[PDB]
From a paper:
The Sc4 amyloid core consists of four β-strands formed by the residues S4–Y35 in the N-terminal region of the prion domain (PrD-N) and the amyloid core region was approximately consistent with the previous observations by the H/D-exchange NMR and mass spectrometry analyses. The cryo-EM structure revealed a short β-strand formed by residues Q47–S53, which was not detected in the previous studies. The WT Sc4 structure reveals that S17 is tightly packed within the core, rationalizing why the S17R mutation is incompatible with the Sc4 structure. In addition, the freely accessible Ssa1/Sis1 binding site (T143-K164) far from the fibril core allows the Sc4 fibrils to be readily fragmented by Hsp104/Ssa1/Sis1 chaperones. Together, the low stability and ready chaperone-mediated fragmentation facilitate the production of many Sc4 fibril fragments (propagons)12 that recruit more Sup35 monomers to the fibrils, increasing overall Sup35 aggregates and leading to white, strong [PSI+(Sc4)] phenotypes.
It has been shown that the yeast [PSI+] prion state is caused by the formation of amyloid fibrils of the translation termination factor Sup35. Sup35 contains an N-terminal highly aggregation-prone prion domain (N or PrD) and a polar amino acid-rich region (M) (M124-D253). Interestingly, Sup35 can form distinct fibril structures, or polymorphs, that underlie distinct [PSI+] prion strains.
Author numbering:
A (entry chain E), B (entry chain C), C (entry chain A), D (entry chain B), E (entry chain D): 4 to 35, 47 to 53
């Protein structure tokens, strides 16, 4: 609970990489040639 | 609950990468040649 | 619940990447040559 | 529930990528050569 | 429930990508050469 001054900077840069900006809560889980360049 | 001044910056940059800006809650889960350039 | 001043910036940039800006809640789940450039 | 000043910016840019700006709730699920450039 | 000042900006830009600006609720589901440029 922000009761003041809050600034947050979220930058994600990848390649073939899954990206999540968030939270994950688990209550009951059962489981079993590219070119990129930046100038 | 924001009771003040809240600024948040969400930037996601990828390639072949799934991107989610959010939260995930699990209550009962059962499971079993590209070119990109930025100037 | 925003009771103040809230500004949020959501930017997603990808290629062949699925993009979701939101939340996912699971209550009962059972499961089993491109060119892009930016100037 | 927004009780104040709320501004949110949602920008999604991709290629062959499915894009959703929203939430997904699952209660009972059973499952089994392009050129693009921006100046 | 917006009880104040709410402004939201939804921009989706893709190619061969399905785009949805909304929410999806699942209660009982059973399942089994283009050129584009922007100046």
């Amino acid at each position: 609970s922000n009761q003041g001054n809050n600034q947050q900077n979220y930058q994600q840069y990848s390649q073939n990489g899954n990206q999540q900006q968030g939270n994950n809560r688990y209550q009951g889980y059962q489981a079993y040639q590219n070119y990129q360049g930046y100038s």
